[PDB]
Design an enzyme around this catalytic site. Structure first.
Site, PDB file in Angstrom:
ATOM      1  N   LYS A 102      41.266  32.755  57.037  1.00 56.70           N
ATOM      2  CA  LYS A 102      41.346  32.767  55.574  1.00 56.70           C
ATOM      3  C   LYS A 102      42.421  31.790  55.087  1.00 56.70           C
ATOM      4  O   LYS A 102      42.515  31.465  53.898  1.00 56.70           O
ATOM      5  CB  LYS A 102      41.611  34.189  55.072  1.00 56.70           C
ATOM      6  N   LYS A 158      34.437  38.310  42.205  1.00 57.19           N
ATOM      7  CA  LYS A 158      35.216  39.140  41.281  1.00 57.19           C
ATOM      8  C   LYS A 158      36.068  38.290  40.332  1.00 57.19           C
ATOM      9  O   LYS A 158      36.134  38.558  39.129  1.00 57.19           O
ATOM     10  CB  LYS A 158      36.123  40.094  42.068  1.00 57.19           C
ATOM     11  N   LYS A 212      43.436  39.155  49.795  1.00 59.86           N
ATOM     12  CA  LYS A 212      42.392  39.438  50.773  1.00 59.86           C
ATOM     13  C   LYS A 212      43.144  39.755  52.066  1.00 59.86           C
ATOM     14  O   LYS A 212      44.355  39.542  52.149  1.00 59.86           O
ATOM     15  CB  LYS A 212      41.516  38.201  50.965  1.00 59.86           C
ATOM     16  N   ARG A 213      42.441  40.265  53.071  1.00 54.59           N
ATOM     17  CA  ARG A 213      43.096  40.590  54.332  1.00 54.59           C
ATOM     18  C   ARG A 213      43.751  39.356  54.948  1.00 54.59           C
ATOM     19  O   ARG A 213      43.244  38.242  54.815  1.00 54.59           O
ATOM     20  CB  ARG A 213      42.082  41.197  55.310  1.00 54.59           C
ATOM     21  N   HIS A 225      27.335  39.999  59.360  1.00 54.19           N
ATOM     22  CA  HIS A 225      28.394  39.681  58.404  1.00 54.19           C
ATOM     23  C   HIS A 225      29.448  38.670  58.863  1.00 54.19           C
ATOM     24  O   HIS A 225      30.428  38.450  58.153  1.00 54.19           O
ATOM     25  CB  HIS A 225      29.118  40.971  57.995  1.00 54.19           C
ATOM     26  N   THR A 239      33.609  38.087  48.797  1.00 49.99           N
ATOM     27  CA  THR A 239      33.180  38.807  47.596  1.00 49.99           C
ATOM     28  C   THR A 239      34.292  38.783  46.558  1.00 49.99           C
ATOM     29  O   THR A 239      34.034  38.895  45.356  1.00 49.99           O
ATOM     30  CB  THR A 239      32.786  40.282  47.890  1.00 49.99           C
TER      31      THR A 239
END
Ligand code: PLP
Ligand code: PLP
Ligand code: CBF
Ligand code: CBF
Lengths: 810, 810
Positions: free
Chosen positions: A548, A654, A542-543, A351, A650
């Protein structure tokens, strides 16, 4: 009532009401005069739960009779979120329960908000396991989710003085109506001890024993009457444990600490002993359960024909040496036979490629905690390397690169290498990620065994991520193409023929507006924050992670602010920029980023000249239940990770399914999303993976960008001078220092293109009709990202089983 | 089916069966193909539980409407035992459930044995609280039992190599169907901190907070539809507790350790901090609950009219200063007013005079843990002593003797003195005990406030101790005088007119024989031990203590053995001597006594010459459920404590009600038992309290008895030489040394009379008809020992409320 929510039959509404009152009386031991909203929530939960047990028992009996190949999904994380509404949706009970509660004078939506989220996960990895369980049940697979029942899940995030504060997630406080303890199936797990080599075999002796007690939770398929099981293990000390008498009893909490709390790390490996214990605990108990079930269906030759074990990342990697230990040491099979069985049974899913996330356990730790497993791992390595040596004679560097054992300061075991060697299939989670695996990180392995490598692009369940959280959208869609798409999302393509339908365009835009008003209200309800529902909802949830790049988003926000201050009476598309996510407790930079975001909001949200043209809100305690609220209300989805770092993502899927346009880099699944919808219907910008490599070859120098971009320079100087932190002028020195001298994710390199791309976003938003038409083009092509497609591929290409959409009897 | 067990109505048996299957399906999530005996037990438990909630809710609603004076029984121990059968008995459901389960093809007795004992007590003190709850509900009092929900109750006793081994009593493992968590009523409890004296009052600040979560268990009255509540508090750490993140979460187990385990001491004080925390925890949470309920019925003048708090021993003594703290510090009442209220609300019951059992807490402990309470205690002491000084001018020694503060090595607080000063009533638990209190230990207090001292002779509930454990006897009794006696045990006197009834004599003897066969079978079932059902069952079951003198029993057993070996072919009445009971883990001498008992059995049970004439069995893991089995099967009850040491005793009453004759000293309740039945129908022997005092005045010298009694000398020499411990000749040196040089309980002084009395017992046993007639005389006069009589006296003479036998609506 809307069509997709089922029928409100006269008999069922009456039946639901009586059972509701029955549970309120007999189960909760309450009367309408003292019952609180929470009591009502539980009465409803038990009533809905009743409707599952019939199907749950039948399903399991069915598997015992037909004895199909069983699929075991091992994961240390299952981010389930709430269960009430999801259960009603899959059982077609939503409207009946809504009606029944209405007739009882209760608002069902209010009761739903009382349920605690089952937060046994950190983010994407845990949520994927949850979506997968839903899809496996919907596709009729005999699947079982196996994990740990943490007493405390991901921490609840509180924001104090703009800083993140963590507090225990005591989710079991009021009880969990969905789980069923099964103390009768408790199994022993061994730790420490030593290995004894006798006449006929090695024996693992003088071990410390910890009991594993299972708790089962039902997993209903979508209206097919299938109810699978998720079994989570809880740690229990044996009764003769430590058996000062009082101290011995109190010390029981030492063995039970194994299932106490979820490690809150996302994409970060922390080599702590407690973590290793959790990993073995789940693996040892699960494999005993698997074998027992297999023996009650003894030549393990057929084992791979009746069993498939999927390793969610390397966390449960010890399943490989544990299976060998059992087959060799206990069942007495010869090594070669056992290895053949193990490899054909196990499959591994990777992952991430970030080095700090890879599991490398120190040998001295495994040596003390699991002595027998270390011996087995060395033997596996020995035989594996002999195979490499035979295939690539003389390539001594390859040998050291592929070894499961890493030499250095402290010897470590590369768990990823262990997984590849012991699995018949290894897959990435998005096309670009899987390619990167074969070209870089696992290049040597791909060259040795090319057949093992595959790709399985991630997906999300359309039940929770569309029907449940966005009924308004699900409804207008069903009005045109029916309900079949809910379990066949590819059918959404039919919406392409409505891209020019003036009525559809109006409805799509209407639902989005309603969702935003609903969210703008919730914001003031539980968080006293007024916002403008007419502005563009710019959201990044998101985290918190450097890869990111929430920081890149921050740079843009500041850019918009400075541009407004420069030309105040110039028009600009109004925006509400929302950023949310938790930071791991020990991740300092991540915690500093949160403070930066709130600090920006403090300045921007109170500047008179700005007005309602720009707001900066930090979404507190982002979690599954919150995602279900903010995603349906978003206009712009921020997916801006540095190319090559987000394995898949992911959240991106969404947002696409719920009517938001996407601004992002060609990273992870974003690539396939753009490919499905068409690049003209996506806002792509920045470096591609190849551009990042080129920059690394020649050396990334942030100073260059700072010297050539005036607007960027102004921002750094504002941060450095204390513009966003008056009382603490050097508060953000670590951030500036990182950005200027050691930014592994090159925020500056993508700044110019990002800002320019954002301008094109604002331009399209000014043309409501065309913005909505592009949205329709996105929703219509989101079908590929259903986890039903993902699971069907795992089933056919890895597990060797065929999915089924056949309803089981009532 | 027997009459006293209720009716097996057609409709109810049908209803019970469907609900049984309903719970098996929906509650246990099982089907008849995989259900185990335990599953069936739970299905039955939930079915019976359903029948209570209706009455439970009504009862509580009734109290809210009528608002009667509430009785609060505070205790750190509640030895409840099993709940299933007791519930059926009180609801008149026994025969219906027996029939219903029979029709389902299940043996209800088998299912009953599956229930775990609720062992939240050590012995007599905890069991008394349990009997009291039953009687209070049966007498219609608005009573509430308040305690701690220990995760681990009294340890399960295992015998290994003749030694006691302790193992955790994980009684909640499979869940507790009887309790209902009430997380909504959680209250905060404070610890540590410091006191701040401001302008208007002292403030207790900087405290550590621990949450108290209540769990309610129903307490049904006997067929009167009343269901009271027992609320037990469980410790929970607040969610911002300690809030390394992981370590902070793991450290939560530190605050939660408060309700982890019951201290296993019987009549022994152990000044440990954890114990003190438990005592304050129960008191602080309970008083907040009491006040809240009182404010929802604000001039605490009426507080004593609506509230009564009974202190079970000094364990909850902190209720006195805590009530003052709340009234003075929080409600702001003046000291004098608060004191008046406190004294009129509190009553204290003393349960022992042994010095090692008296609670004397070191001031430095209270100083650190409860700083405000220590200040209040000093103020109470100050004012109390001023009162003493005024009543006895110049008596300076009296002042130091009565002080709540004891001076010495370390200053301590005498909790008993605190209780007397702050209560309006102080009572002993048996006539002789209450007299001893006034003449010795509390003589100074009695002289100051004579009106405060009372007596309340203990009792046992005839429901659990007759109807439930001995239905055969309850039946033959009901056949002659009806069932009214079950809630009016004085009616048993009517059996006196049957002492010459040849039919009754035969039935009484028949039931006893059946009970012995039943027990002789159980012994071989779960403990592989054959015994002779024709022998006299000589039983001593109670906690192992030097004052209870199991050692004197041992000396007798050895005497019988030696006499047989001396004249083998001489006839002697066959006997099976059974001794059982747990020893506190840290009580060395008690553990040595157990080893001695098993060592004697090892020699006696394997001596060919002895045969089946004498057996010595140690009853393992004696507890409530075991008592229910052995007591109905006993012929001779051993109650041989040294005169003046057993405050009351309750096991003695259980044996008397079940057809056993009693051999004992004039101690505790034995005196009143002999008085009720007539001394000619009791086997009394040994020194009276006055004889013990005389011996102490002149100095006890064990050597004297050893020199004058040949049989006694032989026994000591056998023990000393290793006769009972071949491999370890000096194994019992500590026992012999204690007996010869420092025996505080004078075992030797009562040896001669004890043996002679035992001979008279064997003589009567040889005449079956006359043995049974004396038994009838005992059973017929056991009425006074019903806890219904005890509670009625507490109600009228202490609490100021009238008991009621009126049935509440269905
Ligand atoms: C979907 C989801 C994620 C994953 O989001 P990404 O943007 O792919 O990182 C994380 N957290 C929650 C609560 C989610 O629902
Ligand atoms: C009745 C009882 C006791 C008290 O017995 P005594 O002989 O008075 O000490 C102790 N333990 C249990 C389990 C009981 O039932
Ligand atoms: N390894 C992870 O924890 C992660 O969250 O896993 C998700 C599911 O594959 C991925 O979508 C995501 O890209 C990745 O970071
Ligand atoms: N103090 C105790 O623990 C004790 O067990 O209490 C019982 C109940 O009053 C008494 O019957 C018994 O005599 C006494 O020893």
């Amino acid at each position: 009532q809307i069509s997709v929510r089922g029928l409100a039959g006269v008999e069922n509404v009456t039946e639901l009401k009586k059972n509701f009152n029955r549970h309120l009386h007999f189960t909760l031991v309450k009367d309408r005069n003292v019952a609180t909203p929470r009591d009502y929530y539980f009465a409803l939960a038990h009533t809905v739960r009743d409707h599952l047990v019939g199907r749950w028992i039948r399903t399991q009996q069915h598997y015992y009779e037909k004895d199909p190949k069983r699929i075991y999904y091992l994961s240390l994380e299952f981010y389930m979120g709430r269960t009430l509404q999801n259960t009603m949706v899959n059982l077609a009970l939503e409207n009946a329960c809504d009606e029944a509660t209405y007739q009882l004078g209760l608002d069902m939506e209010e009761l739903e908000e009382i349920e605690e989220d089952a937060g046994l996960g950190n983010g994407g990895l845990g949520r994927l396991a949850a979506c997968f369980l839903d899809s496996m049940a919907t596709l009729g697979l005999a699947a079982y989710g196996y994990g740990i029942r943490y007493e405390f899940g991901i921490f609840n995030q509180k924001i104090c003085g703009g800083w993140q504060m963590e507090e225990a997630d005591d989710w079991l406080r009021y009880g969990n109506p969905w789980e069923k303890a099964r103390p009768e199936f408790t199994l022993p797990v061994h730790f420490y001890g030593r290995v004894e080599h006798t006449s006929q075999g090695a024996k693992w002796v003088d071990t410390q024993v910890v009991l594993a007690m299972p708790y089962d939770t039902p997993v209903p398929g979508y209206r097919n009457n299938v109810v699978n099981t998720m079994r989570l293990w809880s740690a229990k000390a044996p009764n003769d444990f430590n058996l000062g008498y009082i101290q011995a009893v109190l010390d029981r909490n030492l063995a039970e600490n194994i299932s106490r709390v979820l490690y809150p790390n996302d994409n970060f490996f922390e080599g702590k002993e407690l973590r290793l214990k959790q990993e073995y605990f789940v693996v040892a108990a699960t494999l005993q359960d698997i074998i027992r079930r297999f023996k009650s269906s003894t030549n393990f030759d057929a084992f791979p024909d009746k069993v498939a074990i999927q390793l969610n990342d390397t966390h449960p990697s010890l399943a490989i040496p544990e299976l060998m230990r059992v087959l060799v040491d206990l069942e007495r099979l010869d090594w070669d036979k056992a290895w053949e069985v193990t490899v054909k049974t196990c499959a591994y899913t990777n992952h991430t490629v970030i080095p700090e996330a890879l599991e490398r356990w120190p040998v001295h730790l495994l040596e003390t905690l699991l002595p027998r497993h270390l011996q087995i791992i060395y033997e596996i390595n020995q035989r594996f390397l002999n195979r490499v040596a035979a295939a690539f004679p003389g390539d001594v560097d390859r040998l050291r690169r592929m070894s499961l054992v890493e030499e250095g300061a402290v010897k470590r075991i590369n768990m990823a290498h262990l997984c590849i060697a012991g699995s018949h299939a290894v897959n990435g989670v998005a096309r670009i990620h899987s390619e990167i695996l074969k070209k870089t990180i696992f290049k040597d392995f791909y060259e040795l065994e090319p057949h093992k490598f595959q790709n399985k692009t991630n997906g999300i369940t359309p039940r929770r991520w569309l029907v449940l959280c966005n009924p308004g959208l699900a409804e207008i869609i069903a009005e045109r193409i029916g309900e079949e798409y809910i379990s066949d999302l590819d059918q959404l393509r039919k919406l392409l023929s409505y891209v020019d339908d003036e009525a559809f365009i109006r409805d799509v835009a209407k639902v989005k507006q309603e969702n935003k008003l609903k969210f703008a209200a919730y914001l003031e309800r539980e968080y006293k924050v007024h916002i403008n529902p007419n502005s563009l909802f710019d959201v990044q949830v998101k985290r918190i992670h450097e890869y990111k790049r929430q920081l890149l988003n921050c740079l843009h926000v500041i850019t918009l602010y400075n541009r407004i201050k420069k030309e105040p009476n110039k028009f600009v598309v109004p925006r509400t920029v929302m950023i949310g996510g938790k930071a791991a407790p020990g991740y300092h930079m991540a915690k500093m980023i949160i403070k930066l975001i709130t600090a920006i909001g403090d300045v921007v949200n109170h500047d008179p000249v700005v007005g309602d043209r720009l707001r900066v809100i930090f979404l507190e305690n982002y979690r599954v239940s919150l995602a279900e609220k903010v995603i349906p209300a978003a206009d712009l989805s921020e997916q801006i990770s540095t190319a090559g770092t987000e394995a898949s993502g992911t959240g991106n899927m969404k947002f696409m399914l719920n009517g938001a346009l996407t601004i992002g880099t060609m990273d992870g699944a974003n690539v396939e999303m753009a490919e499905e919808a068409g690049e003209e219907n996506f806002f792509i910008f920045g470096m591609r993976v190849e551009d990042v490599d080129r920059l690394d070859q020649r050396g990334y120098n942030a100073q260059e960008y700072y010297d050539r971009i005036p607007e960027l320079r102004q921002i750094i100087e504002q941060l450095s001078s204390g513009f966003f932190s008056p009382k603490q002028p050097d508060l953000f020195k670590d951030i500036v220092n990182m950005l200027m001298h050691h930014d592994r994710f090159k925020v500056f390199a993508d700044y110019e293109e990002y800002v320019k791309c954002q301008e094109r976003v604002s331009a399209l938003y000014k043309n409501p009709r065309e913005w909505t038409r592009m949205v329709i083009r996105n929703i219509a092509t989101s079908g590929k990202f259903s986890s039903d497609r993902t699971i069907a591929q795992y089933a056919r290409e890895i597990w060797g089983v065929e999915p089924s959409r056949q309803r089981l009897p009532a």
